[PDB]
Amino acid sequence: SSSLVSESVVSLAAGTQAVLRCQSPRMVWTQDRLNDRQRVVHWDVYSTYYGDNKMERLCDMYSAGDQRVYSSYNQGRIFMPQNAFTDGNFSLVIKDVAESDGGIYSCNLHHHYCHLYETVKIQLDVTKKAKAAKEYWDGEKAVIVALEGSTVMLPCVNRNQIWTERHLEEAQQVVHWDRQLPGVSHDRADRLLDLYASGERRAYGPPFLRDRVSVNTNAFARGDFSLRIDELERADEGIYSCHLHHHYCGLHERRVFHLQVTEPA
Amino acid sequence: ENTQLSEAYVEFAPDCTIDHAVALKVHTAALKVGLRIVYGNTTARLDT
Amino acid sequence: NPGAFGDIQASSLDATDIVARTDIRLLKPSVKNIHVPYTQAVSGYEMWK
Amino acid sequence: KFHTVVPSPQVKCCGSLECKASSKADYTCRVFGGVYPFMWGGAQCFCDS
Amino acid sequence: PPGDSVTVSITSGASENSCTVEKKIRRKFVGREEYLFPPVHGKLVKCHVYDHLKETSAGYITMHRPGPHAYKSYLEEASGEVYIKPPSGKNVTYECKCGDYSTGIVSTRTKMNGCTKAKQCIAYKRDQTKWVFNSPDLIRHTDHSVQGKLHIPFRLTPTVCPVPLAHTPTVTKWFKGITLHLTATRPTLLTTRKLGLRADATAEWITG
Numbered sequence: 001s002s003s004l005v006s007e008s009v010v011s012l013a014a015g016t017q018a019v020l021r022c023q024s025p026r027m028v029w030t031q032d033r034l035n036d037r038q039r040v041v042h043w044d045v046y047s048t049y050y051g052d053n054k055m056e057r058l059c060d061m062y063s064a065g066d067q068r069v070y071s072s073y074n075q076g077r078i079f080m081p082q083n084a085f086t087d088g089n090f091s092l093v094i095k096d097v098a099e100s101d102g103g104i105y106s107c108n109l110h111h112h113y114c115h116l117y118e119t120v121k122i123q124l125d126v127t128k129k130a131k132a133a134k135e136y137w138d139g140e141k142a143v144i145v146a147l148e149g150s151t152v153m154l155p156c157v158n159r160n161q162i163w164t165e166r167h168l169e170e171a172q173q174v175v176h177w178d179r180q181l182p183g184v185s186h187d188r189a190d191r192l193l194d195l196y197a198s199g200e201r202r203a204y205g206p207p208f209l210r211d212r213v214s215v216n217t218n219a220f221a222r223g224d225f226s227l228r229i230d231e232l233e234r235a236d237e238g239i240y241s242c243h244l245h246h247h248y249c250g251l252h253e254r255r256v257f258h259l260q261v262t263e264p265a
Numbered sequence: 266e267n268t269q270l271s272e273a274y275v276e277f278a279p280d281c282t283i284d285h286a287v288a289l290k291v292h293t294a295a296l297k298v299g300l301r302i303v304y305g306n307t308t309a310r311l312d313t
Numbered sequence: 314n315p316g317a318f319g320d321i322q323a324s325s326l327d328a329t330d331i332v333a334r335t336d337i338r339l340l341k342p343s344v345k346n347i348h349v350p351y352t353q354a355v356s357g358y359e360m361w362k
Numbered sequence: 363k364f365h366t367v368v369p370s371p372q373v374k375c376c377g378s379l380e381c382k383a384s385s386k387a388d389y390t391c392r393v394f395g396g397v398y399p400f401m402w403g404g405a406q407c408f409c410d411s
Numbered sequence: 412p413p414g415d416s417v418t419v420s421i422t423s424g425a426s427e428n429s430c431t432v433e434k435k436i437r438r439k440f441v442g443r444e445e446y447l448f449p450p451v452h453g454k455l456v457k458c459h460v461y462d463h464l465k466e467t468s469a470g471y472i473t474m475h476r477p478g479p480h481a482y483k484s485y486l487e488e489a490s491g492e493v494y495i496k497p498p499s500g501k502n503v504t505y506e507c508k509c510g511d512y513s514t515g516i517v518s519t520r521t522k523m524n525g526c527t528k529a530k531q532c533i534a535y536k537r538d539q540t541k542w543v544f545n546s547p548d549l550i551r552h553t554d555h556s557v558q559g560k561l562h563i564p565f566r567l568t569p570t571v572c573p574v575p576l577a578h579t580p581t582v583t584k585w586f587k588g589i590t591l592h593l594t595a596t597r598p599t600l601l602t603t604r605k606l607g608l609r610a611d612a613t614a615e616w617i618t619g
C-alpha cells in the first residue's frame with residue numbers, strides 16, 4: 001500500500017475505452033544497476049561581487065570516489081570532510097579566505113539512480129579583519145562575513161537517508177494497479193495489474209479483462225503506468241488505485257481514479 | 266578407426282573488465298605550478 | 314608504563330583506590346548509530362606473561 | 363589483567379556540555395559536538411549538529 | 412570461509428548427489444593490515460564486490476545447439492538378429508556401417524538391419540530443440556555454429572568498504588633519529604622513505 005499522493009475521479013460510458021493516466025517520472029528506472037547509487041556533492045561559487053564574474057566550481061566529491069579539487073591552486077585551500085557521505089555532512093572549508101574567495105557558494109548533491117537533487121546556498125563576504133566578521137541570515141541563506149586571511153567554514157549538512165550508504169534493501173521501482181469495486185475497501189481491492197522495473201508483469205481477472213485492463217508496454221522506460229480499460233463494462237467501475245513504490249529512494253506514491261461507469265437507457 | 270579432433274584457445278576472463286593491468290611508456294615529463302602572490306596587501310592567483 | 318608489567322597497581326586486591334595509566338585515547342564517532350570507539354595499548358600483564 | 367569499563371555516553375541534545383574529571387583509575391573524558399546519535403528506534407534526538 | 416575445494420550437493424529425498432572441484436580459497440581483505448572482519452568504526456576505502464542483484468552488464472557466454480547422443484536401451488540383442496525399440500512416442504535415428512553407412516528413421520517403430528552384431532548400430536534421440544553451453548563433456552553437431560548468447564549474472568562493481576584504524580604509535584626522542592613504540596594485535600604493514608635524493612624505501616610487516 002502507498003500513501004496518498006494523487007486522488008481523482010473519472011466517469012465514462014460502457015463500451016468505451018477509458019484511460020486512467022497514472023505516471024511518475026520518479027518511477028523512471030535505469031537498466032544499468034552498476035553501482036547506480038552514485039552520489040555527487042559539488043560546490044559552485046558565483047562571485048556576484050566582482051560584477052559578472054564566471055562562477056567557479058571549486059570542488060567535486062563522489063560517494064565511492066575522491067574529493068577532486070578542480071583547480072590546482074585551490075588544492076589545500078578548499079576542503080570537504082572525507083566521511084561526508086558516510087555522515088551526511090557536506091560543509092566546505094576555505095583555509096584562507098581572501099577577496100577573490102568572496103561570493104555566494106552553493107552546495108549541490110545529486111543522486112543519479114533516483115535522478116534526484118538538492119542544494120543550498122551560503123554567502124561568504126570577506127571583511128578585512130575581525131572588527132566586522134560575523135554571521136547572519138539574509139532571508140534565503142546563511143551569510144558569513146568572513147575573517148580575511150583565516151580559515152572559514154561554510155555549513156551544509158543533509159541529514160537524510162537518501163544521502164547515506166546504510167543498507168536500503170536495494171529496492172527498485174514497482175507498481176500495483178488495484179480496483180476497489182463498489183462495496184469493496186481500499187487496500188483489499190482486487191489486484192488488476194502488477195509491474196516491476198525489471199519488466200515483470202502480472203495480470204488478474206478473466207482473460208478478457210486482462211486484454212481490456214492493460215498498462216502501457218514500456219511503463220518504467222517512461223515513468224508511465226496509464227491503465228487502458230477497453231470497451232468498459234459497468235462492472236469495471238470503482239476506485240482504481242496505482243501504488244508506486246521505490247523503497248530504496250522512499251517513493252510511496254498513490255495515484256487514484258474513481259472511475260464510475262454508466263450505461264444507456 | 267574413429268578419430269577425434271581437439272582444439273583449445275584463450276581469452277580474457279570477464280572479471281578482467283575491472284582487474285586489467287595496462288602497460289605504459291612515458292616520456293618528456295612536464296611540470297605545472299600553482300603560484301599565489303601577495304603585494305600591497307592584495308592577493309593574486311596563477312597557475313602556469 | 315603502558316604495555317609492560319605493573320600497568321595496573323592497587324595497594325590491595327580489593328582496594329577501592331587504584332592508580333594506573335594505560336594510554337587510552339578516545340576517537341570521534343563517525344558512524345550513523347551511537348558508539349564510543351576506544352583505542353588502547355595491549356595489557357602489560359599479558360605481555361609479561 | 364584489567365578490564366575497560368565503557369559506560370554508555372552521556373548525550374546532551376541540541377545544547378552544549380563540558381567534560382568533567384573523576385577519581386577513577388586511568389579516567390579519560392572527552393566531549394564531541396556535531397554528533398548525530400542513531401538507534402534502532404531511529405534518531406534519538408534532534409538539532410542539526 | 413576458505414578451504415581447499417568447492418562442493419555442491421543436492422538431496423533427492425532418498426538419494427544425494429554431489430560434485431566438487433579443487434580450488435585454493437584463502438581469506439583476503441583490503442588495507443595495509445589483514446584483519447578478520449571489518450570493524451564498526453574505521454576509514455572508508457575502495458573495494459570491488461559482486462553485486463547481489465540479478466541484473467548484470469558484464470560478461471558474454473556463448474550457446475549453440477547440441478550434438479548427438481548414444482544409448483544402449485534403444486537396441487536389444489537378446490537373439491542373434493538385431494532389435495531396436497525406440498522409446499514410445501519418440502522419433503529416433505539409427506546408423507551402422509556393415510556394407511555401407513546405412514541409416515534409418517523410426518517413429519515409435521522397430522526397423523531392422525541386415526547386419527547382426529550388437530555393437531554395430533547406434534541410435535540418436537535427436538531433438539535439436541534446446542541450445543547448450545560448450546563443455547568438454549559434450550559433442551558438437553556437424554554444423555559447428557554459434558546460435559545465441561547469455562549474460563553471466565552477479566558481476567563486479569566498485570564500492571566503499573570499511574577498514575580499521577590501527578593503534579596510533581608513540582613517538583620518542585633521539586638525536587638524528589626516532590624510536591617508535593609500535594603496538595598492533597594483528598598483522599600490519601609499516602612503510603617509510605626518506606625525502607632526499609635517496610629513496611631509502613623501507614617496508615615491513617609487524618605482527619605483535
Ligand SMILES: *[C@@H]1O[C@H](CO)[C@@H](O)[C@H](O)[C@H]1NC(C)=O
Pocket residue numbers: 128305306
Ligand atoms: C594596503 O596598504 C596601503 C598602505 O597604507 C593602504 O593604504 C591600503 O588601504 C591597504 N589595503 C588594504 C586592503 O588594507
Ligand SMILES: *[C@@H]1O[C@H](CO)[C@@H](O)[C@H](O)[C@H]1NC(C)=O
Pocket residue numbers: 500501502517518519
Ligand atoms: C518423426 O519425424 C517425421 C518427420 O516430420 C514426422 O513425420 C513423424 O510424425 C515423427 N514421428 C514422431 C513419433 O513424432
